[PDB]
């Protein structure tokens, strides 16, 4: 019967909550209160990229810290040269409702997808001088929301059908399927060692998954609304999330408990994207208020404002070596700060 | 740009910048429309007359040398809250209602109320189509079904003076048709503050005149938008 199973689930949840509460020892703010603050950070716009027609939805930095790819609501993919402000490639898309884009670590392939329920792979290094599509990954029910490369033959995609999957470009089949979320998944993040990954959904919860095992290992809660973006800490034991209630949190994998909260009373809008610096000292988050706030990851103090966009910031990105930071917006303009 | 390779790269970038100018012109001349409905509503029949886990459908039609692009949502989950914000710049939204079943009309009114009050759907006008009108006529002449059994306010209703019953076959049919229309009309006029409008219409099984109606509605919608910006309205 369903009567005893619900009580058993409730008492397991109560036991888990009690164990987590007993695990709590002290707040990170108390430990960090005896460190001098970073100060005032003042970045300025160094480059401006123009050429996009419709709204910009996503972007991804390259591993060489010089090239990047961006997606537009009109169905175009453009590869930019950050130093000389030149355009390298311009790939038209079959479907204009693209929502995400990814860049391969080796620099040989790019990926994109959207409401078409299809993830496409484009080959950049061909004998003939033209970008052509290699494979289309079909099988999802909802819309594609995020995608990240693991190597030249493995990719992880997030879809709106509340399920994640691991694909294989060589065979075009779903190697592994991840289930458990009740709401649709909006974003995912990968670890530097590519052994584990996390994702967030509209059920105000985040889960940690194992690539080979294909099973969930840990769950995080605490947000009052849906999850919009997720970023993963450089160490490999922490990650940060962003929601629509003007609130961001930091979670610890080993401690299994929420860290301090980054929020302000003057913000009523929602977070769209989050990122970390090279050393993990500064946290950058886009908002609906046309600005990009900069926070201190250790003292929870806001130090720096990145203003200059005419519409909402839809995506963010920090380069591999930390030289610069790139922002995208619905005004079809990309700005590089330093 | 001192090196010859840099000059060639600059020339390639200029070439790329010039094919992105042709696209602009084509985009600035098109109009995008969003099609919404339900399983019972014959939107598929309408879009077929106008002419795998697929995500979105696209249909193209032209009238008076003007191109319209319409997007129909395919296989998707029952939740539409998240992806509805990507259509906040379309010309108009077409809604199809099946006026043949009972409490499915109630579901249609609930869906219309939900869509009308959406925050991300502001400054967007809605075109309303009342489909399958012949079934409504055939379902009242034979009796065996009463609207008053589901809507108790049907008895306290009468045909309005401004009504124009072009067929005029039976007063009861006109009364029911105008009651059903006025329900959606009152829902639409319950709010809006003049920023957007509703254009209801009566659609038949084939009705090979909906393109002209959509063209006229779109023309009317853009003229008011331009008159508001230059303070004449």
């Amino acid at each position: 019967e369903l009567d005893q199973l619900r009580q058993e689930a409730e008492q397991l949840k109560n036991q888990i909550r009690d164990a987590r509460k007993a695990c709590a020892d002290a707040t990170l703010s108390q430990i960090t209160n005896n460190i001098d603050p970073v100060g005032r950070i003042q970045m300025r716009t160094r480059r401006t990229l123009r050429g996009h027609l419709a709204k910009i939805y996503a972007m991804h930095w390259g591993t060489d810290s010089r090239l990047l790819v961006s997606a537009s609501q009109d169905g175009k993919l453009i590869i930019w040269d950050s130093y000389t402000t030149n355009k390298v490639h311009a790939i038209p898309l079959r479907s204009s409702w693209v929502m995400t884009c990814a860049y391969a670590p080796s620099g040989n392939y790019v990926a994109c997808g959207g409401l078409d329920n299809i993830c496409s792979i484009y080959n950049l290094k061909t004998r003939e001088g033209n970008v052509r599509v290699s494979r289309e990954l079909a099988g999802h029910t909802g819309y594609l929301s995020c995608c990240r490369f693991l190597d030249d033959n493995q990719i992880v995609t997030s879809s709106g059908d509340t399920t994640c999957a691991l694909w294989d470009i060589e065979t075009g089949q779903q190697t592994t399927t991840f289930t458990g979320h009740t709401g649709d998944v909006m974003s995912l993040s990968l670890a530097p060692d590519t052994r584990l990954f996390v994702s967030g959904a509209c059920d105000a919860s985040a889960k940690l998954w194992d690539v080979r095992e294909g099973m969930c290992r840990q769950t995080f809660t605490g947000h009052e609304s849906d999850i919009n973006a997720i970023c993963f800490f450089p160490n490999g034991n922490a990650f940060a999330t962003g929601s629509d209630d003007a609130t961001c949190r930091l979670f610890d994998l080993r401690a299994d408990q929420e860290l301090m909260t980054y929020s302000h009373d003057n913000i009523i809008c929602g977070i769209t994207s989050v990122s970390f610096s090279k050393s993990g000292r500064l946290l950058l988050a886009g908002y609906d208020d046309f600005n990009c706030n900069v926070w201190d990851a250790l003292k929870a103090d806001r130090a720096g404002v990145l203003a200059g966009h005419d519409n909402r910031v839809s995506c963010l990105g920090v380069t591999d070596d930390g030289m610069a930071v790139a922002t995208g917006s619905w005004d079809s303009f990309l700005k590089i700060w330093n | 740009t001192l090196s010859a390779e840099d000059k060639a790269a600059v020339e390639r970038s200029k070439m790329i910048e010039k094919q992105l100018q042709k696209d602009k012109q084509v985009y600035r001349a098109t109009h995008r429309l969003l099609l919404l409905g339900a399983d019972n509503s014959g939107k598929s029949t309408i879009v077929k007359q106008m002419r795998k886990t697929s995500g979105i459908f696209e249909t193209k039609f032209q009238v008076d040398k003007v191109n319209f692009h319409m997007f129909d949502v395919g296989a998707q989950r029952d939740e539409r809250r998240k992806w509805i914000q990507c259509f906040n710049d379309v010309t108009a939204i077409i809604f199809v209602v099946d006026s043949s079943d009972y409490n499915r009309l109630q579901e249609a009114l609930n869906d219309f109320k939900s869509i009308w009050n959406n925050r991300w759907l502001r400054t967007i006008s809605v075109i309303l189509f009342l489909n399958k009108q012949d079934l409504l006529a055939e379902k009242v002449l034979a009796g065996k079904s009463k609207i008053e059994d589901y809507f108790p306010e049907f008895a306290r209703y009468t045909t309005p003076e401004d009504a124009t019953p072009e067929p005029g076959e039976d007063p009861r049919v006109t009364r029911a048709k105008y009651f059903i229309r006025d329900e959606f009309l009152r829902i639409s006029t319950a709010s809006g503050d003049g920023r957007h409008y509703c254009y209801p219409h009566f659609t038949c099984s084939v009705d090979t005149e909906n393109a002209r109606r959509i063209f006229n509605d779109c023309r009317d919608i853009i003229q008011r938008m331009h008159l508001r910006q230059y303070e004449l309205l």
């Epitope: 010089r66 390298v88 001088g129 033209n130 | 090196s3 010859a4 390779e5 000059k7 060639a8 020339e11």
Partner: single-chain antibody, 233 residues
């Protein structure tokens, strides 16, 4: 991916002929084209060049008012016009594809060549100290190249190229920008330099390494070639 050339023959002095190079198997409209001349018993020499957009055209200082180049994107065919042929205008001609962007590898594929026989300053000087050397099938081989000016640019690139034309076939590409290896070249060739003197190192050796190695630079676009060193096994 194959290039075919047509024309050639023996003509009287003062004549005129039109040379063509036909492309097939790739997007010919996005690659620049060069003409390279090679005497029967001498090295290579550049002739002319047309960019992808036909907005930039260069000519060799040897002949500028007698040679005309043209291209046709729709049918993917290159053209070369020669007027008032002289005694010196007798050599082998090749058409070379090239594309310029970040990370690109220009001068990657060459044509077959057509023969044409005629009856009887401020540019960087590139020289090669050696011309022939016998080696052992399995030991190391070192080839040195010299320049009269620093090839290093302010950005940080060193424009040096290695071709190694085989004795009986068209040239190839081994090292571009003095440090990067090509696609189909086995991972046994390497190159290094300091800014004025450069060396080419081959770890292993096989029967297919027999040929003449050429030296070329692309700094300020004089396009001057080297002398060439022949290897015999």
């Amino acid at each position: 991916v194959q290039l075919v050339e047509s024309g050639g023959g023996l003509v009287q002095p003062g004549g005129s002929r039109k040379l063509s190079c036909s492309a097939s198997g790739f997007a010919f409209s996005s690659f620049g084209m060069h003409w390279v001349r090679q005497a029967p018993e001498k090295g290579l020499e550049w002739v002319a060049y047309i960019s992808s957009g036909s907005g930039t055209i260069y000519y060799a200082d040897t002949v500028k008012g007698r040679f005309t180049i043209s291209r046709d994107d729709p049918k993917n065919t290159l053209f070369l016009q020669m007027t008032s042929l002289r005694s010196e205008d007798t050599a082998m001609y090749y058409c070379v594809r090239s594309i310029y962007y970040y990370g690109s590898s220009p001068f990657d594929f060459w044509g077959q060549g057509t023969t044409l026989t005629v009856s009887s300053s401020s540019d960087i000087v590139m020289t090669q100290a050696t011309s022939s050397v016998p080696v052992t099938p399995g030991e190391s081989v070192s080839i040195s190249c010299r320049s009269s000016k620093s090839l290093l640019h302010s950005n940080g690139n060193t424009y040096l190229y290695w071709f190694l034309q085989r004795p009986g076939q068209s040239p190839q590409l081994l090292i571009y920008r003095m440090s990067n290896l090509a696609s189909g070249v086995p991972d046994r060739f390497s190159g290094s330099g300091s800014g004025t003197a450069f060396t080419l190192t081959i770890s292993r050796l096989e029967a297919e390494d027999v040929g003449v190695y050429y030296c070329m630079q692309h700094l300020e676009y004089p396009l001057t070639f080297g002398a060439g060193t022949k290897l015999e096994l």
